[PDB]
């Protein structure tokens, strides 16, 4: 059978380089193509090798070894812009596409000033809900989920805001439960020692 | 530029009197692919005629080979009668053996 | 083995008499049809029973799919032509591709493009360039050029993709295309002496008359490899004869690694 | 000069409804495509028109049917729709045949769901929850939290509104919806988006927010016979002002 292999998921960080295999055994070789696909949005074309060789393209490169059944996908610089799946896909003797899967690549923000810190967002007189929002830690803490099935805690998300040059992660968690607050929702995690946790 | 077509009438085997033979008309080297091809006996068209199909040349020419089964007599004469855009009239090649 | 091609044929016709196709393709292996596809079918289908025996209905489907779309393409390639020529009535567009594995194991990759029956524009393989033959050509060939991932998969088709197709088709028609019938050879006078020879497969052959042990090709009328119609060809050579001098005529015939003499007494 | 134009973008179906995906491309291109995607396999083919007057069957073609009515449409028939062929659907399009180089073009995708029975479908609740007086004393920086939860399927579109006009640097939506029941396979879903502003600019009492998610569900002609409201496609949405 015709197989096209690539990893599930790949983590970098923000001004790294990152090489994305994918490796085929098809029946027949008429080129491979890479296509950049961003969540909830199109494929688009990024390259296509069908001889042996590196061809670059801006801060991207696509490599092709005919002999291996192998190519990478290399990213220069990475920027949070490139957080993405990428797609590589293969022409067989009859011209038909074989598709991998895809790797998702994850791109870790350099944060320059960590300040991590779990804040209580203001009720909403319209929800019975508690919102709390950890936020402004470094890249490598990761954020687990609630193993109280009335807790909600959503994973990390990098915001920029353009005028100041400034990004930031944050993860929120809230419930209507009575013994939910800030200072344990996310216990489940493995927090910095220095985390602000202001007084209620 | 058009090519007209090379005509070469023949037995399938080297022909004796009395046995069962074919007798081809090969027509190569013409372009345009438009030509109308037929066998002769006595300057009567032959019926079962068959053709293999339109044919080609790597110098851009078309070839075809015409046959039919029959068995050679000293009387009988047979031809071959090609049409073509490059042939003012139809061109008649007898079967010389 | 002894050396192998296989070629794909296209044919564009502009304005062609009804009932004639405006569009035929045609696959051979050496001087075997091996497929075959028109605008008035509308299927690609086998010319020979080794390739309908070896290849699936899923590629018959497959390329008959290819084959409409490649039609469409040929059309508006020679409405282009046609256009720039600024030709009235019927032309002729034509595509050849293909490649070769020779007896000592070499290759050899080819594609190119006629109108009305002559050259347009052949492909460089090995400078990755189009050459054209005139400024209609010229025209099409910056375009061509400027699409240098497409030169790129053309060199690869030919060179790896097309070898392998020939090898496949090779093995489907090992036992007609690998086999030899050898040659049954006579000589007579009609003055001139014939060399004839018939019978044999494959079809390539040499015939030639020699005098007193020398080759003088000028003095040689060398006749066609023709096809008998039984899958065998038949071809010919003659010399006249010098009435003023005696010498000795010799048919010399080679064919599939043998060779043969007739002396004429 | 719009390139490939597919649509709806998103869809709930009744196992047993007909429905038709439609695409367009204005790129003179000859062959186009269906596609599905879904989650761990790459795109999988349904069918294919290599050219104006053809079209033959992909990978996968059972229980759908196309028509490439013209050179620029080629639409994909669901007859009788069926819970897997709950994906998402891409047209794409190409110059030429898959023969040679050439790269293909994508539409935006369709998002599908197919569901047994519509008592399923929800729409979000939406909440704007204000930001943290220690944040702003401690970071000179203020995050508003908007909630949308409980919605079904996963056809939203979330957005900021900033003093009556759509918002986009500073914000932040989660990439992927969290299940509520991630255990269940018809869980309803939760997702969070942060806007995050200067101090000084919640600061301001003439600045109003608005979180604002817009919901695909159900339309006129989808029967209804829960004692709920009707899920019909919608917009949900919450406000927060500044503060001086
Ligand atoms: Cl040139
Ligand atoms: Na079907």
Request: glycine share 6%; hydrophobic share 35%; with cysteine.
């Amino acid at each position: 059978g015709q197989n096209i292999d690539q990893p599930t998921e790949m983590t970098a960080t923000e001004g790294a380089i990152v090489q994305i295999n994918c490796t085929y055994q098809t029946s027949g070789f008429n080129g491979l193509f890479w296509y950049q696909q961003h969540a909830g949005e199109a494929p688009t074309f990024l390259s296509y090798n069908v001889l042996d060789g590196l061809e670059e393209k801006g801060r991207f490169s696509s490599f092709l070894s005919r002999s291996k059944g192998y190519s990478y996908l290399l990213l220069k610089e990475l920027q949070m812009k490139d957080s993405a799946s990428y797609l590589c896909a293969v022409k067989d003797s009859n011209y038909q596409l074989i598709w991998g899967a895809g790797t998702k690549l994850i791109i870790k923000p350099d944060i320059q000033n960590p300040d991590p810190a779990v804040y209580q967002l203001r009720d909403s007189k319209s929800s019975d809900k508690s919102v709390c929002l950890f936020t402004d830690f470094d890249s490598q803490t990761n954020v687990s989920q609630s193993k109280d099935s009335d807790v909600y805690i959503t994973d990390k998300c990098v915001l920029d805001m353009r005028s100041m040059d400034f990004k930031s992660n944050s993860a929120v968690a809230w419930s209507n439960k009575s013994d939910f607050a800030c200072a344990n929702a996310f216990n489940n995690s493995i927090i910095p020692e220095d985390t602000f946790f202001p007084s209620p | 530029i058009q090519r007209t077509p090379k005509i070469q009438v023949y037995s399938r085997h080297p022909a004796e009197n009395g046995k069962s033979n074919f007798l081809n008309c090969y027509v190569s080297g013409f372009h345009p692919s438009d030509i109308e091809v037929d066998l002769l006996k006595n300057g009567e068209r032959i019926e079962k005629v068959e053709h293999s199909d339109l044919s080609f040349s790597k110098d851009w020419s078309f070839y075809l080979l015409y046959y039919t089964e029959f068995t050679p007599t000293e009387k009988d004469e047979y031809a071959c009668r090609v049409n073509h855009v490059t042939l003012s009239q139809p061109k008649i090649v007898k079967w010389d053996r | 083995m002894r050396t192998h091609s296989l070629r794909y044929f296209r044919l564009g016709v502009s304005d062609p008499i009804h009932g004639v196709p405006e569009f035929i393709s045609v696959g051979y292996v050496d001087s075997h049809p091996i497929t075959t596809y028109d605008s008035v079918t509308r299927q690609k289908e086998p010319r020979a029973p080794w390739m309908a025996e070896n290849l699936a209905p899923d590629h018959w489907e497959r390329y008959t799919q290819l084959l409409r779309g490649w039609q469409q393409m040929f059309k508006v390639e020679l409405k282009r032509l046609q256009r720039h020529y600024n030709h009235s009535g019927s032309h002729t567009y034509q595509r050849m591709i293909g490649c070769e594995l020779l007896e000592d194991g070499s290759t050899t990759g080819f594609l190119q493009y006629a109108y009305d029956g002559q050259d347009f524009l052949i492909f460089n393989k090995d400078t990755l360039s189009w050459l054209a033959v005139d400024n209609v050509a010229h025209t099409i060939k910056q375009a061509w050029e400027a699409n240098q991932h497409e030169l790129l998969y053309q060199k690869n088709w030919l060179e790896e993709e097309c070898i392998a197709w020939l090898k496949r088709f090779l093995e489907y028609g090992k036992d007609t295309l690998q086999r030899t019938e050898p040659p049954l050879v006579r000589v007579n006078r009609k003055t001139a002496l014939f060399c004839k020879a018939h019978g044999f497969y494959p079809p390539e052959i040499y015939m030639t008359w020699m005098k007193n042990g020398e080759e003088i090709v000028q003095e040689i009328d060398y006749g066609d490899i023709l096809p008998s119609g039984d899958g065998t060809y038949q071809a010919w050579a003659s010399i006249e004869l010098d009435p003023q001098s005696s010498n000795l005529y010799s048919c010399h015939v080679e064919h599939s690694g043998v060779h043969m003499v007739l002396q004429v007494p | 000069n719009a390139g490939v134009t597919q649509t709806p973008k998103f869809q709930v179906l009744k196992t047993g409804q007909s429905m038709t995906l439609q695409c367009a491309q204005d790129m003179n291109h000859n062959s186009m495509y269906w596609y599905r995607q879904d989650p761990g396999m790459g795109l999988r083919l349904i069918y294919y028109s290599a050219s104006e007057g053809t079209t033959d069957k992909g990978e996968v073609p059972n229980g759908y049917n196309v028509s490439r009515l013209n050179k620029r449409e080629f639409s994909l028939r669901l007859e009788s729709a069926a819970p897997s062929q709950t994906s998402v659907y891409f047209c794409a399009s190409s110059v030429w045949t898959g023969e040679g180089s050439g790269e293909l073009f994508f539409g935006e995708g369709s998002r599908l769901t197919v569901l047994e029975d519509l008592k399923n479908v929800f729409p979000p609740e939406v909440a704007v929850f204000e930001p943290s007086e220690a944040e702003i004393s401690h970071t000179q920086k203020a995050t508003l939290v908007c909630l949308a939860t409980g919605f079904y399927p996963d056809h939203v579109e979330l957005s900021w509104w900033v003093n009556g006009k759509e918002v986009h640097s500073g914000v932040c939506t989660d990439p992927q919806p969290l299940k509520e029941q991630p255990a269940l396979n018809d869980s309803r879903y939760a997702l969070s988006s942060r806007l995050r502003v200067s101090a000084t600019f919640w600061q301001n009492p003439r600045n109003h927010f608005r979180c604002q998610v817009q919901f695909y569900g159900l339309s006129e002609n989808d029967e209804w016979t829960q004692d709920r409201a009707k899920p019909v496609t919608q917009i949900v949405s919450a406000e927060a002002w500044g503060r001086a």
